[PDB]
Structures are given as structure tokens and as C-alpha cells.
Amino acid sequence: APPGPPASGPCADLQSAINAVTGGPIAFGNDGASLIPADYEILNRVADKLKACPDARVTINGYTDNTGSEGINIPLSAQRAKIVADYLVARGVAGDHIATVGLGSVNPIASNATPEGRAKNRRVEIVVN
């Protein structure tokens, strides 16, 4: 038997474990689409946690405020998900195990009346699928 506590169900609730690495969803200010080095280290740990259960694919969604238009918010929502996906794949995930979704301005969570609110609704998120 190995040292330390037991390790049963190592992928059985990994949704909660992946959320615990991220501490929740991630925002986009100043430039509105420019991801931080502090997040890219969180993404290193998410990539390793996915790589510990290549049996359990993920899907990555991203959002934008509604000050833009569909022809601007479709590429912006997809780009936020693709930036996370490309970072995870570069750290060690197989491209087969990550999907991406453009949630442009649907199911909004902040008003566009302030630049902070825009960043709070430009959010990106991850879910096991």
C-alpha cells in the first residue's frame, strides 16, 4: 500500500476538483481579451488534472458583453475558449479531449454600463463532458 491518505474515485467528482484549481470562472479587462500569466499557471494545473484522467473530455465556453454585435461577439467568445484550449494542449492535453463553444453574449451575468462589468461578463468557463 502507498504512503499518505487513500485516493479512491480519482476522477469520480473531478468537476469539483477542476473548479477548486480554477477558484471559479476567469475575466478579461483593459484590452478585453488578454489573458494573464497568473491565470496561465492555474491553467498549467488544470492541464495536469485533465492529463490525470484522459478518459474524461472537457468543454470550454466563453462570453462577451453585448456592446458589440454577433459578427464581433462570435469570434470573441470563440477566441476566449480557444486561448484556454491552446494553452492546455501546449501544457500536455490531447486536442481530442478539449471542445470549445462561442457563448457570445447569452445568459449574461453583468451589465455593460461599466468597464469592470464588461470584464465580469467577458468570462470564460470549463466543464467536464
UniProtKB/Swiss-Prot annotation:
Instruction: Please report any disulfide bonds recorded for this protein chain, giving both cysteine positions.
Output: 11-53
Superkingdom as given in the UniProt entry: Bacteria
Location in or out of the cell? Secreted, Cell wall; Cell outer membrane
The record places domain OmpA-like at 15-129
* Function of the molecule: Probably plays a role in ammonia secretion that neutralizes the medium at pH 5.5, although it does not play a direct role in ammonia transport.
Entry's family note? Belongs to the outer membrane OOP (TC 1.B.6) superfamily. ArfA family.
What is the official name of this protein in its record?
Peptidoglycan-binding protein ArfA
